[PDB]
Scaffold this active site. Structure first.
Site, PDB file in Angstrom:
ATOM      1  N   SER A  22      20.966  23.710  12.492  1.00 54.08           N
ATOM      2  CA  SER A  22      21.598  24.981  12.448  1.00 54.08           C
ATOM      3  C   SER A  22      23.104  24.477  12.324  1.00 54.08           C
ATOM      4  O   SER A  22      23.550  25.951  11.855  1.00 54.08           O
ATOM      5  CB  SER A  22      21.287  25.561  14.011  1.00 54.08           C
ATOM      6  N   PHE A  23      23.792  23.910  12.662  1.00 53.97           N
ATOM      7  CA  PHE A  23      25.099  23.689  12.451  1.00 53.97           C
ATOM      8  C   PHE A  23      25.468  22.301  12.056  1.00 53.97           C
ATOM      9  O   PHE A  23      26.375  21.704  12.439  1.00 53.97           O
ATOM     10  CB  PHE A  23      26.083  24.011  13.845  1.00 53.97           C
ATOM     11  N   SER A  24      24.511  21.676  11.187  1.00 54.09           N
ATOM     12  CA  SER A  24      24.757  20.228  10.542  1.00 54.09           C
ATOM     13  C   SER A  24      24.006  20.330   9.468  1.00 54.09           C
ATOM     14  O   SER A  24      22.866  20.780   9.253  1.00 54.09           O
ATOM     15  CB  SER A  24      24.413  19.347  11.643  1.00 54.09           C
ATOM     16  N   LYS A  41      25.569  12.538   8.882  1.00 59.72           N
ATOM     17  CA  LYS A  41      25.440  13.799   9.515  1.00 59.72           C
ATOM     18  C   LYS A  41      26.738  14.677   9.400  1.00 59.72           C
ATOM     19  O   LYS A  41      27.894  13.957  10.012  1.00 59.72           O
ATOM     20  CB  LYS A  41      25.173  13.884  10.882  1.00 59.72           C
ATOM     21  N   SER A  90      21.603   5.434  10.506  1.00 55.23           N
ATOM     22  CA  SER A  90      20.937   4.588   9.503  1.00 55.23           C
ATOM     23  C   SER A  90      20.049   5.522   9.033  1.00 55.23           C
ATOM     24  O   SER A  90      19.949   6.456   9.422  1.00 55.23           O
ATOM     25  CB  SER A  90      20.120   3.559  10.528  1.00 55.23           C
ATOM     26  N   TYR A  91      19.673   5.288   7.836  1.00 57.12           N
ATOM     27  CA  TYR A  91      18.774   6.036   6.890  1.00 57.12           C
ATOM     28  C   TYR A  91      17.268   5.701   7.102  1.00 57.12           C
ATOM     29  O   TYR A  91      16.845   4.492   6.821  1.00 57.12           O
ATOM     30  CB  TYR A  91      19.066   5.742   5.323  1.00 57.12           C
ATOM     31  N   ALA A  92      16.580   6.627   7.751  1.00 64.08           N
ATOM     32  CA  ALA A  92      15.234   6.468   7.868  1.00 64.08           C
ATOM     33  C   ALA A  92      14.496   7.101   6.827  1.00 64.08           C
ATOM     34  O   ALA A  92      14.228   8.172   6.689  1.00 64.08           O
ATOM     35  CB  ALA A  92      14.853   7.347   9.234  1.00 64.08           C
ATOM     36  N   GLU A  96      10.114  11.942   8.828  1.00 62.20           N
ATOM     37  CA  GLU A  96       9.751  12.657  10.280  1.00 62.20           C
ATOM     38  C   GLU A  96       8.171  12.086  10.293  1.00 62.20           C
ATOM     39  O   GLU A  96       7.366  12.237   9.338  1.00 62.20           O
ATOM     40  CB  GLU A  96       9.810  14.004  10.350  1.00 62.20           C
ATOM     41  N   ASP A 135      14.207  16.234  24.309  1.00 59.23           N
ATOM     42  CA  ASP A 135      13.592  17.092  23.051  1.00 59.23           C
ATOM     43  C   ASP A 135      12.823  16.192  22.204  1.00 59.23           C
ATOM     44  O   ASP A 135      12.913  16.257  21.053  1.00 59.23           O
ATOM     45  CB  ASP A 135      14.761  17.533  22.070  1.00 59.23           C
ATOM     46  N   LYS A 137       9.867  14.798  20.212  1.00 56.39           N
ATOM     47  CA  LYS A 137       8.766  15.785  19.303  1.00 56.39           C
ATOM     48  C   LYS A 137       8.648  15.035  18.110  1.00 56.39           C
ATOM     49  O   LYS A 137       9.545  14.124  17.609  1.00 56.39           O
ATOM     50  CB  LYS A 137       9.311  17.102  19.318  1.00 56.39           C
ATOM     51  N   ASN A 140      11.671  14.319  15.731  1.00 53.88           N
ATOM     52  CA  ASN A 140      12.593  13.719  16.245  1.00 53.88           C
ATOM     53  C   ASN A 140      12.465  12.360  16.314  1.00 53.88           C
ATOM     54  O   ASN A 140      12.904  11.485  16.738  1.00 53.88           O
ATOM     55  CB  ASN A 140      13.118  14.431  17.331  1.00 53.88           C
ATOM     56  N   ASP A 153      18.273  12.572  17.438  1.00 59.33           N
ATOM     57  CA  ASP A 153      18.602  13.852  17.896  1.00 59.33           C
ATOM     58  C   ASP A 153      18.909  13.779  19.336  1.00 59.33           C
ATOM     59  O   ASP A 153      18.492  14.242  20.240  1.00 59.33           O
ATOM     60  CB  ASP A 153      17.337  15.049  17.778  1.00 59.33           C
ATOM     61  N   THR A 175      12.163  21.993  23.171  1.00 61.57           N
ATOM     62  CA  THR A 175      11.383  22.699  22.256  1.00 61.57           C
ATOM     63  C   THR A 175      10.157  23.103  22.931  1.00 61.57           C
ATOM     64  O   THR A 175       9.582  22.619  23.369  1.00 61.57           O
ATOM     65  CB  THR A 175      11.167  21.681  20.813  1.00 61.57           C
TER      66      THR A 175
HETATM   67  N1  LIG Z   1      18.939   9.085  10.218  1.00 61.73           N
HETATM   68  C1  LIG Z   1      18.353  10.124   9.374  1.00 61.73           C
HETATM   69  N2  LIG Z   1      17.661   9.502   7.999  1.00 61.73           N
HETATM   70  C2  LIG Z   1      16.662  10.317   7.527  1.00 61.73           C
HETATM   71  N3  LIG Z   1      16.621  11.517   7.615  1.00 61.73           N
HETATM   72  C3  LIG Z   1      17.439  12.325   8.672  1.00 61.73           C
HETATM   73  C4  LIG Z   1      18.053  11.372   9.272  1.00 61.73           C
HETATM   74  N4  LIG Z   1      18.750  12.409  10.489  1.00 61.73           N
HETATM   75  C5  LIG Z   1      18.064  13.431  10.111  1.00 61.73           C
HETATM   76  N5  LIG Z   1      17.285  13.323   9.088  1.00 61.73           N
HETATM   77  C6  LIG Z   1      16.551  14.670   8.506  1.00 61.73           C
HETATM   78  O1  LIG Z   1      17.554  15.753   8.410  1.00 61.73           O
HETATM   79  C7  LIG Z   1      17.008  16.951   8.931  1.00 61.73           C
HETATM   80  C8  LIG Z   1      18.074  17.763   9.629  1.00 61.73           C
HETATM   81  O2  LIG Z   1      18.927  16.876  10.802  1.00 61.73           O
HETATM   82  P1  LIG Z   1      19.833  17.647  11.682  1.00 61.73           P
HETATM   83  O3  LIG Z   1      19.863  16.687  12.957  1.00 61.73           O
HETATM   84  O4  LIG Z   1      21.026  17.862  10.845  1.00 61.73           O
HETATM   85  O5  LIG Z   1      19.310  18.974  12.126  1.00 61.73           O
HETATM   86  P2  LIG Z   1      17.751  19.336  13.054  1.00 61.73           P
HETATM   87  O6  LIG Z   1      17.697  18.453  14.253  1.00 61.73           O
HETATM   88  O7  LIG Z   1      16.495  19.167  11.954  1.00 61.73           O
HETATM   89  O8  LIG Z   1      18.020  20.870  12.859  1.00 61.73           O
HETATM   90  P3  LIG Z   1      18.138  21.603  14.394  1.00 61.73           P
HETATM   91  O9  LIG Z   1      19.592  21.042  14.613  1.00 61.73           O
HETATM   92  O10 LIG Z   1      18.701  23.071  14.009  1.00 61.73           O
HETATM   93  O11 LIG Z   1      17.325  21.513  15.492  1.00 61.73           O
HETATM   94  C9  LIG Z   1      16.060  16.510  10.112  1.00 61.73           C
HETATM   95  O12 LIG Z   1      15.230  17.394  10.485  1.00 61.73           O
HETATM   96  C10 LIG Z   1      15.390  14.934   9.545  1.00 61.73           C
HETATM   97  O13 LIG Z   1      14.364  15.436   8.750  1.00 61.73           O
END
Ligand SMILES: Nc1ncnc2c1ncn2[C@@H]1O[C@H](COP(=O)(O)OP(=O)(O)OP(=O)(O)O)[C@@H](O)[C@H]1O
Ligand SMILES: O=S(=O)(Nc1nc2ccc(Cl)cc2s1)c1cc2ccccc2s1
Length: 289
Positions: A22-24, A41, A90-92, A96, A135, A137, A140, A153, A175
């Protein structure tokens, strides 16, 4: 001691967008000096200022900076320029958990048990530090290259105050499908609220959908407070028993909560009989099929 040189955007080659919030926005980035990959991020300052999101950004940084455990996304560094804030995460690589639930439909018993055990282990760590996620789920719960979980998250997480022996948190966050009945009725959450979400997630791994389902939030809320759900056929019996011990309206009666004497009894549940708890992150996860 001193710390490494503060990083800057020009220290990275940015690649694909990994996702948008939403804002990232999360962008894959390679650090030039190391060739390391990070998920960065990025938040626009004027936007989160305008939209009163600064407290969530501060919260995400502060809570993540406290974590030091293999089942969480790590916050390596932060930096900013005039327009933006940057979190180096870290890059996952495998994304999800939700993606795999959708693809496969239903986890088998071995996979349900393993991934449930990793989530339980992660919550044990978080709750031991007095932190409520709020949160939890599958969206996350990310997966690294080796298919271990990486919970993320934390902007809506809460560090309970040790000084006041705080047990309840008053912010309304979460959620709908995973929100606890106490948040809906008492307007506060506690560590045990995450155990409710765990129950929903275990159910979802086996059933394919979470237990409280409807086309809008208010209908979901109504089901939650009535404990209105059922189990599909063939639902692994010991998993069903576990879920029935987590999806309990009274938050003080959930297996794993402080009033039920903590994680020992939860880890001792018969569904986990074959689990070796001590070193899960070094075990090879079962293949998802
Ligand atoms: N550390 C990470 N490694 C790999 N992918 C990621 C990582 N962090 C986030 N992501 C992916 O980026 C997406 C966007 O993450 P971000 O935290 O900016 O928003 P969000 O939590 O999905 O949305 P909202 O904030 O609106 O609930 C995530 O849904 C996830 O799929
Ligand atoms: O200590 S902080 O809380 N200070 C902050 N400065 C700003 C400036 C503008 C905006 Cl929109 C939010 C924040 S918040 C912080 C810096 C930072 C950098 C990167 C990622 C998260 C955070 S939180």
């Amino acid at each position: 001691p001193p710390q490494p040189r503060k990083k800057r955007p020009e220290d990275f080659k940015f690649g694909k967008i990994l996702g948008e919030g939403s804002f990232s926005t999360v962008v894959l980035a390679r650090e030039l000096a190391t060739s390391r990959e990070y998920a960065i991020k990025i938040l626009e300052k004027r936007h989160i200022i305008k939209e009163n999101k600064v407290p969530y950004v501060t919260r995400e940084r502060d809570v993540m900076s406290r974590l030091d455990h293999p089942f969480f996304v790590k916050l390596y560094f932060t930096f900013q320029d005039d327009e933006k804030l940057y979190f180096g995460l870290s890059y996952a690589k495998n994304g999800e958990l939700l993606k795999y639930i959708r693809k496969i439909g239903s986890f088998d018993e071995t996979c349900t048990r393993f991934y449930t055990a990793e989530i339980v282990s992660a919550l044990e760590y978080l709750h031991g530090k007095g932190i409520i996620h709020r949160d939890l789920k599958p969206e996350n719960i990310l997966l690294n290259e080796d298919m271990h979980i990486q919970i993320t998250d934390f902007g809506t997480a809460k560090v309970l105050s040790p000084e006041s022996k705080q047990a309840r948190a008053n912010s309304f966050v979460g959620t709908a499908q995973y929100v606890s009945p106490e948040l809906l009725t008492e307007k506060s959450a506690c560590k045990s609220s995450d155990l409710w979400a765990l129950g929903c997630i275990i159910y979802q791994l086996v059933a394919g959908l979470p237990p409280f389902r409807a086309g809008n939030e208010g209908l979901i809320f109504a089901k939650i407070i009535k404990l209105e759900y059922d189990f599909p056929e063939k639902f692994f019996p010991k998993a069903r028993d576990l879920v029935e011990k987590l999806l309990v309206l009274d938050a003080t009666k959930r297996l794993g909560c402080e009033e039920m004497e903590g994680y020992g009894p939860l880890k001792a549940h018969p569904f986990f009989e074959s689990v070796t708890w001590e070193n899960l992150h070094q075990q090879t996860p079962p293949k998802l099929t």
